[PDB]
Amino acid sequence: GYDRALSIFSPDGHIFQVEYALEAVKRGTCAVGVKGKNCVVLGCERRSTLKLQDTRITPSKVSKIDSHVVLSFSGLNADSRILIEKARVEAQSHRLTLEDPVTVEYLTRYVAGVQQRYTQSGGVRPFGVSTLIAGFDPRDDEPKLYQTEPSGIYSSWSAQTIGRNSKTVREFLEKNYDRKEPPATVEECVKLTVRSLLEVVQTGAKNIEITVVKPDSDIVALSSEEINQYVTQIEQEKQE
Amino acid sequence: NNYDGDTVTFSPTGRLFQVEYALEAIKQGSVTVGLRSNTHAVLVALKRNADELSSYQKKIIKCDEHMGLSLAGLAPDARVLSNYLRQQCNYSSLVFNRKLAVERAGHLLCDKAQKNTQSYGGRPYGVGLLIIGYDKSGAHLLEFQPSGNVTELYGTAIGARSQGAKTYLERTLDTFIKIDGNPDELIKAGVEAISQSLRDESLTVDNLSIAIVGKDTPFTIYDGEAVAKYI
């Protein structure tokens, strides 16, 4: 079998294949995650270079791993499917053996472990994907939001963004998100998430996707018109 | 130069550079001495610390009741090779009810090291070993190089500044070979030998490591206050 060590150290102590995988993430469409007091919202950018697209059937950017956990990503689309499939299989395996669904932290730790493994295994390249994993632990009402990256490191975030121009939207979130008082309602959380994407997106039309996850497996994706109403209200307050 | 990228490549003059580079790791290692009489065989090793808070790296490894070695170079490679010797000594005892001859132990180490010098993907071992033992033909001392070359000697030294100890043993040859039935005097000769390789530093109580095997003496290692008697 093909055994070649593709991920190796350089004289300055860097693993370039892992670092170049991050550059693929930088190219991917922007993704953002914001947790409120009783919810988490995942926002995603859709590049409008592709029209004549069939939006019914085109792969959506946010994926359910289980009924209570979701995963979004920035980077190589094909690579992300492999991580999503593995995560979905592990979620069902956990239910089968432990008789309890995965915690958001456990599912994050698994996906991050897979990513790390692909950085010191022979004959494979790292995943060109960073992920945002969000949801609620079984029988728990505390919101959860985690991030993973090609190297395999992971951590919890009050709010985070990944992908192209994520430096800009992180700037926005760092001055607009207060830890002592997070977005108390679904409305406030969605509004702050749409606002953060409007710093980067272009037209607020079919370029913004929003998914709301609440406790007890309550997950719903907002439609074009519902998001369009947030886009409208934000700029009418801005004209002042 | 263009011929040192892997162990599977001869140079135009017939040299194997990866093996020569592995030999270089031994020269960077701390000094260790081996010598024997007709009744006993002795190892003396200068242990190296990282700093003043750190411990002194152990240099001597027991392989059986009648055999053991000292190392100089990559310590993990010595652990792999000493583990192999432990297994081979053990196979001989379990299957044949026979203590493994020191000479045969040398042959086995040679062949194990050789396979890593002729194949792609692998690397040579980066450690030198001094094996002492007492078997059915008396006391023995062996020197192992990761090129595969194993040599039986009266005395020797490997590591940094080992040339000073080796010359001393070459002078003292006729004296220390006759030290029969006196373990303390044979160790004294070994401690005096390793002293010819010291600069700036001297032999302290946590610096010195000594091992001995003989006629009615199982392979035993002395460290700490057990070597203060010889300082």
Binding site: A21, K51, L76, A78, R81, G123, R125 | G121
Partner: protein
């Protein structure tokens, strides 16, 4: 040893791109143009054969349009031999699904499977990727008529109208201009042929340089029919739409 001669087909560039995928896409841009258009009452697949000869036996020839099952077909752009390897795998997957569940495979599930196979060749194995882009035209009872595309990276997306191969930039602009949502198959047939006629590198668009197919519910009552057009039938539709 052998490392010396390894091209390392599955590595990132400093910019985070996959060399071999990018170069395989460059190869595909020289292949004959294939177009897919989705309407309310069916799907059209149109594709241009590459500079042919008068001595080529056209009526027994197939290089562009392939049947995967009775409900799903593909248009090919790239290395034909590479495509046939993947096509046979896709045909087997469809039959595996039919045997397991006793239902025809949903279009997206087949597309995802082939796309995952392409992805694997970019991440492990040290082999070159498949130099192929597909347009998938299909029908199932969940989403109805569907168009997808996949490329050597293993990424796939859904479309109302799409082109692959040569001159996709020009073709996609022309499709974006004249496509409407309430369009019908007969209108889509005309759009596909008009677009190829304008984007082609040949002097004129004739029957012997085309492969054509429709997927219609124009099959007697609630069922779907695939129609791979014959050379004479392509000649007739060219006259009907006023191109020859």
């Amino acid at each position: 040893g052998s490392r010396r001669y390894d091209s390392r087909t599955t590595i990132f560039s400093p910019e985070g791109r996959l060399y071999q995928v990018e170069y395989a896409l460059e190869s595909i841009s020289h292949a004959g143009t294939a177009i897919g258009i989705m309407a309310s009452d069916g799907i059209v697949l149109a594709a241009e054969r590459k500079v042919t000869s008068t001595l080529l036996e056209q009526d027994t020839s197939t290089e562009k349009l392939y049947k995967l099952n009775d409900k799903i077909a593909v248009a090919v752009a790239g290395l034909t031999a590479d495509a046939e390897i993947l096509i046979n795998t896709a045909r087997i997957h469809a039959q595996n699904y039919l045997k397991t569940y006793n239902e025809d495979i949903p279009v997206e599930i087949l597309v995802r499977r082939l796309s995952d196979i392409k992805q694997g060749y970019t991440q492990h194995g040290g082999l070159r990727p498949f130099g192929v882009s597909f347009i998938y035209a299909g029908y199932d009872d969940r989403y109805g008529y569907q168009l997808y595309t996949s490329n050597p990276s293993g990424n796939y997306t859904g479309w109302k109208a799409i082109s692959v191969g040569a001159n996709t930039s020009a073709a996609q602009t022309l499709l974006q201009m004249d496509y409407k949502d309430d369009m019908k198959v007969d209108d889509a047939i005309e759009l596909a042929l008009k677009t190829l006629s304008k984007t082609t590198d040949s002097s004129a668009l004739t029957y012997d340089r085309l492969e054509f197919a429709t997927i219609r519910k124009g099959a007697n009552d609630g069922e779907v029919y695939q129609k791979i057009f014959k050379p004479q039938e392509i000649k007739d539709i060219l006259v009907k739409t006023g191109i020859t």
